[PDB]
């Protein structure tokens, strides 16, 4: 007599991530109470289980949700607002003045919600969020059942979010207390950048991150000019200064990291630092060339993120992964750099580990949360199918995602979003388009 | 009383390419006998015309078909066959031996046909094809109503296509004679590479290309090792040798061009040479960094191509354009390089001009052929819509293409392919997958 479980998903291919470079043909995944309870051949699964419901996708690959390890998601409302302009013109004359005019709880809620639809439609199931009004974001992600590490911004300058150091840290503390032990939402400190966060604020982040047990999410070594300005002001590269401040350790999520030495690579490896690679943003802003292959081979935990929609301009992790994989080869002058399996690992388990969720998501293993994605591979764009891992990285587009679950709850069903209305989303986006136009 | 025309396409946005950087809101395009006969505000068009049929796409951008200016389209059957391997292992141990085993008219016809479906579904309407069995390819493109400049391969080594110099040139001559004055298919010489084509064969291409009035389609300066091997063998960089052979002129389509000097840039500008940029292939093979911004600002006609599906691994020109645009900024250390309008220009009119079709395709102007694409912009992935050109380059995915016409004939209608059956295409691709597996 079969054993009950809540859901059985049968697929043409299961890609567990752990073990590495393995593809399980004709396998199924059983789920109960949001948790993965079995991964096994589909014939073996049909004898073993009496699922309350079964989902069969014989043409699809089933893999863990992609983990977008660096977002500013309300900026979906600023999609393409200021393209093809140098960084300081982009920021000073476009991004900051628009943000100043529009940032508040409504803007953050609507932009985050728009991002959640875009992320689900493209098979992303978790984010490492970095934006003002983190309180609203956490609530929005939680309401939609979407997984997130939500950062509390710390910066030396006043904004609508907080006008003083004490206020930024009071908000951070409130965010952490509200979300302690939540299964979907965790919290992090997000000091903005080495050039916008003073030594005293960095010291306070170090102390509170240890006290409250939170990661530290930091834009680091993103540009040549950042490194040079740091030498002028502090006599030291930023990583050297952060090291002396006590911020280079197994809590640090270092984003961008385009300007780097070997010492620094092994520094990151020894201390347990994660690097988030955002290649499309880096290329588009002319920030430089993160040595992703060097970091990966030095055993630095590597994740992949998109950054925001004013410098990408999409949240497409399938694209981001492909860009990471092909750029890594050219930068390293080495065609074996960041192979398909390794890149897919970074996009799932690498991101999971960077956000401190490594034990709960990122691979299809018994006991982990059922954050899962079906990618249709029967589309002619992904045929013939010589190698499934190759196909997911170098040929599949994000529109081939057909089904998405987060903690076993259906979020996208045959390309349809559950409890979201795309028409209302689009109408809301047009309002914001008009408001920004007046600024 | 209204004036008759065959077809009126009404769209939310018309992007004519000529004039540059212009977007016509709420405009229509009238077409008769496959030719564009008017471009004008939709209200003005409804009073003027009595179309036999009208297509209304109020949420869409209408633009010229994308021109993929470098393909090896039968290699769609080799999609992902050998990823993450260095160039000489890729070629010698995988690509050449598989091609040797499978190349023939059936393989070329099936692979080309597969590519035509993928290209149409992604809004590509013209190719610059470079493969064995060009006779079969020309016939296949013509049968599907798909525009192509089809190259006759010239190479010093025997293959199933031709076993001697005389045979390669006899085939080339036959191809040209069969397709003279065809409105859809034109022909070019395709000497393979400087290192596979001897001086005598290059001389023969120069003479026949002038005599028969054909372009010359040549992989040029693709790799460091190509340039160095040339210095060893000929005492000269390859462009210097081709210059002395008389091949650097207004017939040359130079593909890849990753290894380049300034002299060479101005050389190309002075002589009317077109460069085809294939960024994704270049990055994936670690070939290097074509100075696309440098070439464009030096007035070198620049086009964009995908190369083949064993080194991309898709035929996605929306992606290729985005990669070209963002890579150009990082390579040039200049965020204003290859802006959205300029990149879109390269993808349409630049390709048109590279293939010698500049007077017939590449912009929405009266008198040109009605090769047109509707891109749905109402998808949330492309909202809010702050700038249409930005959106087409940095956010739109190829699955947002909804309708495609070539010479005014519908090829893709609401994502449905006309006179193609995707299921048969997929079944055929699986056969080839099995055959290759045995090699
Ligand atoms: Mg992107
Ligand atoms: Mg591609
Ligand atoms: Zn805590
Ligand atoms: Zn950024
Ligand atoms: Zn950022
Ligand atoms: Zn002729
Ligand atoms: Zn190639
Ligand atoms: Zn090629």
Automatic annotation (TrEMBL), chains A, B:
Binding-site list for Zn(2+) 1: 70, 72, 219, 307
Residues that hold Zn(2+) 3 according to the record: 222, 307
Positions bound to Zn(2+) 2: 176, 212
Pfam assignment, any one: Amidohydro_1
Keywords linked to the UniProt accession: Hydrolase, Metal-binding, Zinc
Keyword Acetylation: no
Residue span(s) of domain Amidohydrolase-related: 62-409
InterPro entries xrefs: Amidohydro-rel (IPR006680), Metal-dep_hydrolase_composite (IPR011059), Metal_Hydrolase (IPR032466), MTA/SAH_deaminase (IPR050287)
Residues at which Mg(2+) binds: 280, 312, 314
GO molecular function, one term: deaminase activity
Keyword Metal-binding included in the entry's annotation: yes
PANTHER family xrefs: AMIDOHYDROLASE-RELATED DOMAIN-CONTAINING PROTEIN, AMINOHYDROLASE SSNA-RELATED
Family of the protein in this entry: Belongs to the metallo-dependent hydrolases superfamily. ATZ/TRZ family.
This protein's name: Amidohydrolase-related domain-containing protein
């Amino acid at each position: 007599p079969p054993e009950p479980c809540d859901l059985l998903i049968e697929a043409g291919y299961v890609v567990p991530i752990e073990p590495h470079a393995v593809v399980l043909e004709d396998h199924a995944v059983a789920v109960s109470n949001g948790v993965i309870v079995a991964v096994l051949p589909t014939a073996d699964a049909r004898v073993r289980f009496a699922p309350a419901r079964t989902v069969s996708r014989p043409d699809a690959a089933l893999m863990p949700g992609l983990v977008n390890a660096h977002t500013h998601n309300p900026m979906t409302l600023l999609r393409g607002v200021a393209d093809d302009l140098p960084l300081m013109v982009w920021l000073q004359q476009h991004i900051w003045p628009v943000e100043a005019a529009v940032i508040g709880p409504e803007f953050v809620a609507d932009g985050t919600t728009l991002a959640i639809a875009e992320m689900l439609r493209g098979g992303t199931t978790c984010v490492n969020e970095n934006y003002f009004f983190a309180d609203v974001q956490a609530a929005v992600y939680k309401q939609h059942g979407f997984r997130a590490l939500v950062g509390a911004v710390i910066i030396d300058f006043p904004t609508a979010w907080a006008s003083s150091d004490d206020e930024y840290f009071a908000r951070a503390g409130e965010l952490h207390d509200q979300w302690r032990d939540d299964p979907l939402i965790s919290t992090a400190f997000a000091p903005h950048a080495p050039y916008t966060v003073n030594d005293a604020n960095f010291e306070r982040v170090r102390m509170l991150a240890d006290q409250l047990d939170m990661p530290v999410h930091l834009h680091t070594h993103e540009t040549a000019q950042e490194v040079a300005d740091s030498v002028a002001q502090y006599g030291q590269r930023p990583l050297a200064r952060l090291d002396r401040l006590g911020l280079v350790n197994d809590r640090l999520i270092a984003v961008h990291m385009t300007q780097l030495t070997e010492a620094e690579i092994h520094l990151c490896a020894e201390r347990g630092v994660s690097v988030v690679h955002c290649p499309e943003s880096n290329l588009k802003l002319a920030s430089g060339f993160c040595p992703a292959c060097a970091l990966q081979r030095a055993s630095v935990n590597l994740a992949i993120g998109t950054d925001g929609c004013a410098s990408n301009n999409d949240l497409d992790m399938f694209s981001e992964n492909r860009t990471a994989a092909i750029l890594a080869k050219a930068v390293a002058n080495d065609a074996t750099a960041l192979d398909a399996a390794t890149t897919l690992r970074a996009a799932t388990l690498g991101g999971a580990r960077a956000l401190g969720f490594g034990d709960r998501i990122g691979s299809i293993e018994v006991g982990k949360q059922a954050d899962l994605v079906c990618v249709d591979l029967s589309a002619l764009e992904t045929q013939p199918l010589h190698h499934v891992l190759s196909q997911l990285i170098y040929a599949a587009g994000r529109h081939q995602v057909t089904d998405v679950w987060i903690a076993g709850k259906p979020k996208l069903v045959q390309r349809e979003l559950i409890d979201m209305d795309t028409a209302a989303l689009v109408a809301n986006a047009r309002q914001w388009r008009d408001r920004i136009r007046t600024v």
